[PDB]
Symmetry: C3
């Protein structure tokens, strides 16, 4: 639906994934933090190519398509919320209920035949762990757990994070996250030095192809993902050689991190533990449009009470956000940006030359192709 | 030519209008004020996607296509008018007569077989009320009055105006101008408050007078237009309601304006009276290219002598230009800009949901489709 | 390959040239001066649409495609030359030999089956006369002499020059260089005024079409070019007339230059003598992409020894660079930029109206169509 059929015929291992330039419809995605949306302060964002409005009304979140039914303007150009329960388009005052999107009033013509006979698209919205998730899909949503990595929703897991807009397609971000050999780019990170991490340059893979990953397609809340098992039977590379000479060494530190690495539909990485042995990292790559993603980064730590939560918040602000979320992952940002040109014409999916550690990436591409809940298309965006 | 047949086949009754992305050929259009084009000082502009040169020679205006026949450069890159009657291309000195476009000389090769056997396109130009009009069409032009609204050319009518380039397609500007319900956007205007205008939020169409428009096809100079009668025959909304609760009032005021509102081919609105009881507003939305128009605004006031003309100019500079042309119509500008996205892929023409007051807009779309004098195409532009 | 088949059918005689939007493959092209690339300091550039890296190692130049075989990143985003003889991709440390492009190591997986089984594209590089030439083509190259004008490689010919990036297609540059009538644009040049040049406004051609040029398809080293002979039979125009009135004169200077003007594949102009009677100008119009070229200008003067070399370097800096390479050719730069719009859609090749002096340009388009060593296509650029 999105890519030249002639390219899709050349990527038969994972053609639906290559078609999914706008992401997968009918999944939950995080778009902002709960603390960023105040009572009665609607916010605009673009998700899977669609402009949306989110509002908090008596503490509850609601999501309306930011596109008037009448002349297709963004209501957000000039927000008019004239009652708690409604928003009025600024142009001809078509008025919609947040709760169900029904056209309930038109201020410029209270006799219109359109009143009560039209509905603006709404999307389900849930807050969990101080994160705002939108179900960009149609019909009854699944539990949020389906589209979140294991442990993210644990009662005692405290989540703190950072969000920003990155100019690469979401898939280049997912693959960069889940790529076992990309950790070469992190060899000079401040985090690796100041937090004393064991970080190899890469891994010489051991065992058979089928042992390099574990597909999870039998999780009982319907979660679908892949674990990277390259470190299980693989030999970590700490001495980089050219023609047999050592030219580079890996990070010779004491702290073992990233024993468990997994990627989940719709596009969320879990790294456990990271960036410290007592915490884990969960990061989403949320499709905004064909060219752009939200890099929605979270660190989780079990905290038993308000005192542990406060101690974690203080370490997050003082150490883990600047050292790890910024000082380690900033190199991922320009890596993603560097892949844009090759994949921009959809040709890089045919012309890439993969090697052994990309087994993790190919397993993800297949999992995503088989288990996605729909391919978002320009028809969903416009129609 | 300009729009996919898949869209046009879905808009029967006004498909020519939807195809007319670049405007209608074979009409007059205003492009600048007389004072902006000085004797022997050529000016460049783009009209209906064509680059044009205008010059004043012995007081009279001429217009050549700003594209050399030879290698297709704009002559205006380096203007060389070496005699009163001619322009010489800067590149190889092909020399054209302003009066008829004829290639009369080539300075680089006075023996060329091209001399006297080629002609650069010319367009008629006329000045009226201090406004420069170009006939962007072929063959001998109709009278200017065919393409101007009633009274604009009246002997006593003093015209003052403002012109600027706006980044929307021309049709979004025309529809914004003629839209009976869009007056909702003007509810907070300083003009409405300070000049004591009566301005409803909108109109409930009137049950005792069923015809919401009057087509003028029967005019004496052949002008073609539509009068909006909703406001004359409708029930004005001064108390806008949501769930039956008043959430917004209209503007009460002594001064009744816009008794008669009409749109005319090729795309010029007349509002009478406006912004004061003895004035009229005439505004054009002149196509520059697919994405851009001139918003050519004028205010007319009958003036018997130089003292009345002087008083009107003072009034215009101190009050009407800042309060009305800027203050009031600035909200029309961002309204037009806000419609761009929905119409940019041509899908808005199919996906819009109209309501009752849009009968005025559909009447215009059908009038324009029936009585335009030609659809401008890329073949006219490049060629 | 590059242009709508419809257009190519309307230009039959020179269709391969109209197709050659990215330039001709399997030719040498200058891209920088020798003194701009230091030992072990790689430089990036784009040539015929391909991103390339050039390095100097033990004084010798090497050229690798700047696109990793693995995920298609530019290695130049973060250059890692970890041994004298190699470059390591910053992403997964795929390590390539400069000499033959062979993938000789991967630091992230020294056990990979890809090692020794892949090679990055390399291009030959040759330095001559202080200029860096890349053979943008396949297989063992021809002698550089084939792709340089006569006398450029003469033992005693001292070359000095200037390079810059210009926003036009390379062919608009070539035609502007070789066009006999375009000298009209140079009539006010500081070089003409200050160096007392004789410069007509143009020529009235004499003799047959065949007599207006001399095709060199028969040169001993395989050079392919056209001499402009318009001034052999041609009558110089020094009095430009409109309606038989003189409106402009040529330059009546004592100094005679540009006796011999020739254009050579792959797109290099030779003007002898210029800008003074014992110097030659050799200038290349090197394709960067569809929209861009290097304007690689050089001035040659024969010098017997180190002392003549130094005097020429001084007059180049104080006189010839500013007065000629800038004061004369700057008008050529904006002339090229002015042709972009008409040729951007490929329609100008069909819609232009040529005149008699364009027989030089037609002879070049025919020579280029017949004798080019290959049409660069998006398949070469992409894969
Ligand atoms: S575009 Fe929203 S009410 Fe008209
Ligand atoms: S482009 Fe105008 S005379 Fe050649
Ligand atoms: S992209 Fe260069 S080594 Fe992976
Ligand atoms: Fe990373
Ligand atoms: Fe308005
Ligand atoms: Fe020149
Ligand atoms: Mg709801
Ligand atoms: Mg005329
Ligand atoms: Mg009032
Ligand atoms: Mg008055
Ligand atoms: Mg080599």
């Amino acid at each position: 639906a999105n890519v030249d059929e002639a390219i899709l015929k050349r990527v038969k291992g994972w053609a639906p994934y290559v078609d999914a330039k706008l992401g997968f419809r009918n999944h939950w995605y995080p778009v902002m933090f709960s603390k960023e949306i105040n009572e009665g302060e609607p916010k605009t964002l673009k998700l899977l190519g669609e402009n949306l409005l989110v509002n908090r009304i008596d503490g509850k979140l609601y999501c309306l398509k930011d596109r008037c039914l009448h002349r297709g303007v963004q209501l957000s150009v000039k927000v008019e919320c004239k009652t708690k329960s409604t928003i009025t388009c600024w142009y001809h005052a078509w008025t919609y209920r947040w709760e169900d999107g029904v056209l309930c009033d038109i201020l410029t013509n209270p006799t219109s035949a359109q009143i009560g006979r039209q509905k603006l698209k709404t999307y389900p919205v849930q807050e969990a762990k101080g994160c705002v998730f939108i179900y960009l899909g149609d019909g009854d949503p699944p539990p949020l757990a389906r589209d979140t990595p294991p442990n993210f929703l644990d009662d005692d897991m405290e989540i703190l994070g950072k969000n920003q807009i990155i100019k690469s397609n979401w898939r280049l971000a997912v693959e960069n996250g889940f790529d076992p050999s990309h950790i070469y780019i992190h060899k000079d990170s401040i985090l690796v030095k100041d937090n004393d991490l064991a970080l190899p340059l890469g891994f010489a893979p051991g065992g058979d192809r089928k042992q390099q990953t574990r597909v999870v397609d039998d999780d009982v809340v319907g979660r679908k993902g892949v674990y990277d098992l390259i470190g299980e039977h693989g030999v970590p590379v700490f001495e980089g050689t050219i023609g047999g000479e050592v030219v580079r060494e890996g990070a010779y530190g004491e702290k073992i991190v990233a024993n468990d690495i997994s990627i989940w539909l719709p596009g969320v990485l879990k790294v456990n533990p990271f960036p410290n042995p007592d915490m884990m990292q969960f990061e989403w790559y949320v499709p905004i449009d064909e060219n752009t993603h939200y890099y929605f980064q979270t660190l989780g730590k079990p905290c038993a009470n308000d005192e542990e939560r406060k101690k974690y918040e203080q370490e997050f602000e003082s150490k883990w956000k600047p050292m790890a979320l910024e000082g380690f992952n900033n190199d991922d940002i320009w890596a993603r940006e560097a892949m844009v040109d090759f994949y921009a014409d959809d040709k890089g999916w045919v012309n890439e030359i993969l090697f052994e550690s990309d087994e993790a990436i190919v397993a993800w591409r297949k999992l995503a192709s088989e288990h996605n809940q729909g391919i978002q298309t320009q028809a969903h965006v416009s129609g």
